[PDB]
Amino acid sequence: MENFQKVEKIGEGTYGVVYKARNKLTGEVVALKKIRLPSTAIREISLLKELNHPNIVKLLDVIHTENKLYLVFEFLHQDLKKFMDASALTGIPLPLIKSYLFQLLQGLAFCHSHRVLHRDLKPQNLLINTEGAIKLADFGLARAFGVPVRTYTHEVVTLWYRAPEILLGCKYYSTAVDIWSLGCIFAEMVTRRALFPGDSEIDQLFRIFRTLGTPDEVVWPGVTSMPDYKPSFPKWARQDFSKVVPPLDEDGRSLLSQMLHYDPNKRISAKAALAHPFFQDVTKPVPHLRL
Ligand SMILES: Cc1nc(C)c(-c2ccnc(Nc3ccc(N(C)C)c(Cl)c3)n2)s1
């Protein structure tokens, strides 16, 4: 770590704090994730160094030294969260929303083809550059490790993009959890409001049920047998997407509805989503970035 000079803090994840830093050997600026503290973890994270794609933030190095684990990522100039906040008065242009969703589906189709799941997509780990690219950052493992950031900071775990199977206690979930999260982020880019801003696990689940209807065996076979399912859940009727994401057109609303299917087996895959008619006229616009 003597080779890196911290510039400023740029983020706080669930298990690590992220800094902008300078590599003293090469002169390059990087994003450095510091995890406060497992051999299986070192091996699995090292496998992520091989997972290279245009829509994935490059994991440059894994440094294991003195009861800390440092992840060195390529540096991108802004996150989607800052861009959405900066665009709150005007809205992100629909062609740019479509480009970003298309690129993130390309990134997910690639990592899902290598049986790599993100598991915690959110605007703070979607990174953009001045050329119009957007990239997925910091893929999570199935087994969590290290001191959680919430125990030594004022930061809280966001549940807003969590798939309903995770909230209902499925421990052997699929790549469909990332498609759900991405659908939630797509709706938030379009409407400029989070789709399901829950502040507890039950509030998160009941916000999903109030919009999409309480799931039952008809729409989700096996839902009533899931670990955290309760027959005492209130029964809410489903709402129309025309109410949930105006002014999205019918192709975008149909795609979103397929990304938000309750049954993970019915939920569209990233590969199938790339072929959706919504992307017939996709382009790659330039964002207006204030850095
Ligand atoms: C939570 C995160 N995890 C990672 C690994 C992150 C990462 C990876 C690569 N580049 C960047 N850049 C970046 C992020 C945020 C900001 N401001 C707007 C908060 C900036 Cl100015 C740059 N962040 S951000």
CB contact at 8 A, 119 and 111: no
Q: Tell me the CATH number at 186.
A: 1.10.510.10
How far, in Å, from the CA of 131 to the mean position of ligand 1? Answer: 17
Q: Residues 103, 204: one domain? A: yes
How far, in Å, from the CA of 13 to the mean position of ligand 1? Answer: 10
List the Cα angle 278/280/283 in 5-degree steps: 100
Q: Residues 152, 241: one domain? A: yes
**Burial of 53 by CB count in 10 Å (0-12 exposed, 13-18 middle, 19+ buried)?**
middle
Q: Residues 69, 119: one domain? A: no
Q: Residues 104, 210: one domain? A: yes
The range of the structural domain enclosing residue 153 comes to 78-289
Q: Is 120 a catalytic residue?
A: yes
Last residue of a domain, one of 51, 77, 103: 77
Query: ω into residue 247 within 30 of 0, thus cis?
Result: yes
Which of the following is catalytic: 61, 85, 120, 240? Answer: 120
User: In three state form, how does the secondary structure of the chain look?
Assistant: CCCEEEEEEEEECCCCEEEEEEECCCCCEEEEEEEECCHHHHHHHHHHCCCCCCCECCEEEEEEECCEEEEEEECCCEEHHHHHHHCCCCCCCHHHHHHHHHHHHHHHHHHHHCCCCCCCCCHHHEEECCCCCEEECCCCCCCCCCCCHHHCCCCCCCCCCCCHHHHCCCCCCCCHHHHHHHHHHHHHHHHCCCCCCCCCHHHHHHHHHHHHCCCCCCCCCCHHHCCCCCCCCCCCCCCCHHHHCCCCCHHHHHHHHHHCCCCCCCCCCHHHHHCCHHHCCCCCCCCCCCC
Please count the structural domains in the chain. Answer: 2
Length of the chain: 291
Whole-angstrom CA distances from 117 to 58, 79, 108, 142, 175 are: 16, 20, 8, 9, 6
Q: Residues 114, 30: one domain? A: no
Nearest CA to ligand 1 atom 19: 10
How far, in Å, from the CA of 157 to the mean position of ligand 1? Answer: 17
Q: Residues 63, 100: one domain? A: no
Resolution in A: 1.5
Nearest CA to ligand 1 atom 18: 78
Last residue of a domain, one of 77, 98, 120: 77
Q: Residues 99, 65: one domain? A: no
Q: Residues 47, 174: one domain? A: no
Q: Residues 204, 62: one domain? A: no
Whether residue 57 has its Cβ less than 6 Å from ligand 1 = yes
Q: Tell me the CATH number at 57.
A: 3.30.200.20
Last residue of a domain, one of 16, 44, 77: 77
Token pair for 123: 């605007």
Whether residue 81 has its Cβ less than 6 Å from ligand 1 = no
Q: Residues 203, 265: one domain? A: yes
Whether residue 84 has its Cβ less than 6 Å from ligand 1 = no
Q: Residues 48, 96: one domain? A: no
Which residues make Cβ contacts (< 8 Å) with residue 43, sequence separation at least 6?
none
List the Cα angle 182/185/189 in 5-degree steps: 135
Q: Residues 180, 96: one domain? A: yes
